[PDB]
Design a protein around this ligand. Structure first.
Ligand code: KJ5
Ligand code: BGC
Ligand code: ZN
Length: 257
């Protein structure tokens, strides 16, 4: 099955998932000079006060923090979005070293990691139907740099020892994703895809300009996770990022002048 290694990684995905070579693949490099301020973007609304986290899962590619999306609690709206998008999960991509790990790049700069908060468009009823639509998903992407610790991340860090290997999960209730946001909501936006197989072209990407800082100790604990299952030879879960893909017939819009 697909992964991030030499024999199953991003350069192989197109064989099982030919959309990998499609017209609106993600991630992309964000050329800050070419991105254009868009006055038609409405204010972005990140409304996470009633979020209900449930569980954290090592899926063999990353770890997902899952939310109760059975009703409108944690939602994203405004900006480029038409209607209401409900938070279903978040996860990260990260590197083996601090100089790589992000999926999006900014003027070709790679960050140490990238957080993805995944939301589905409520007009389609469920996530599965949403991923059959060109506007089914909105992913809020947040870069991580290594510096001061992010206090709101520590609860995630401290549970990772209990989900070291593929297929392990743990209760993860009462986690507040507001503690993972930077101060500014300035963002870039463009139409793209899932960055993992099945690579479906359903996503409105909203990538925040301001990174969050996490400590070296925090990201080092991400790097102790395993891609493999329990009892199998250890393959550290590192470098679980897809590189930038061709922009093709797309423009990146900026929320800020
Ligand atoms: C199918 C579940 C799923 C992912 F596994 C995933 F990695 C992403 S991503 N990296 O594009 O944010 C999604 F948006 C997503 F919906
Ligand atoms: O034709 C002019 C238009 O070209 C488009 O490619 C740009 O996105 C618009 O901002 C611009 O007004
Ligand atoms: Zn992701």
């Amino acid at each position: 099955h697909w992964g991030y290694g030499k024999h199953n990684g991003p350069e192989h995905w197109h064989k099982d998932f030919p959309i990998a070579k499609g017209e609106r693949q993600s991630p992309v490099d964000i050329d800050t000079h070419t991105a254009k301020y868009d006055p038609s973007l409405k204010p972005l609304s990140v409304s996470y006060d009633q979020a209900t986290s449930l569980r954290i899962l090592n899926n063999g590619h990353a770890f997902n923090v899952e939310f109760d999306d059975s009703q409108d609690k944690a939602v994203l709206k405004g900006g480029p979005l038409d209607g209401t998008y409900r938070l279903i999960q978040f996860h990260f991509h990260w590197g083996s070293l601090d100089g790589q790990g992000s999926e999006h790049t900014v003027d070709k700069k790679k960050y140490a990691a990238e957080l993805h908060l995944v939301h589905w468009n409520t007009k389609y009823g469920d996530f599965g139907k949403a991923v059959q639509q060109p506007d089914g998903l909105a992913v809020l992407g947040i870069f991580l740099k290594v510096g001061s610790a992010k206090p709101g991340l520590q609860k995630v860090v401290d549970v990772l020892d209990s989900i070291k290997t593929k297929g392990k999960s743990a209760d993860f209730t009462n986690f507040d994703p507001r503690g993972l946001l930077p101060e500014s909501l300035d963002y870039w936006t463009y139409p793209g895809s899932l960055t993992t197989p099945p690579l479906l072209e359903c996503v409105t990407w909203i990538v925040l300009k301001e990174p969050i800082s996490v400590s070296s100790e925090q990201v080092l604990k991400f790097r102790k996770l395993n891609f493999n299952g329990e009892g199998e030879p250890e393959e550290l879960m590192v470098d679980n990022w897809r590189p930038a893909q061709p922009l093709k017939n797309r423009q990146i819009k900026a929320s800020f002048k």
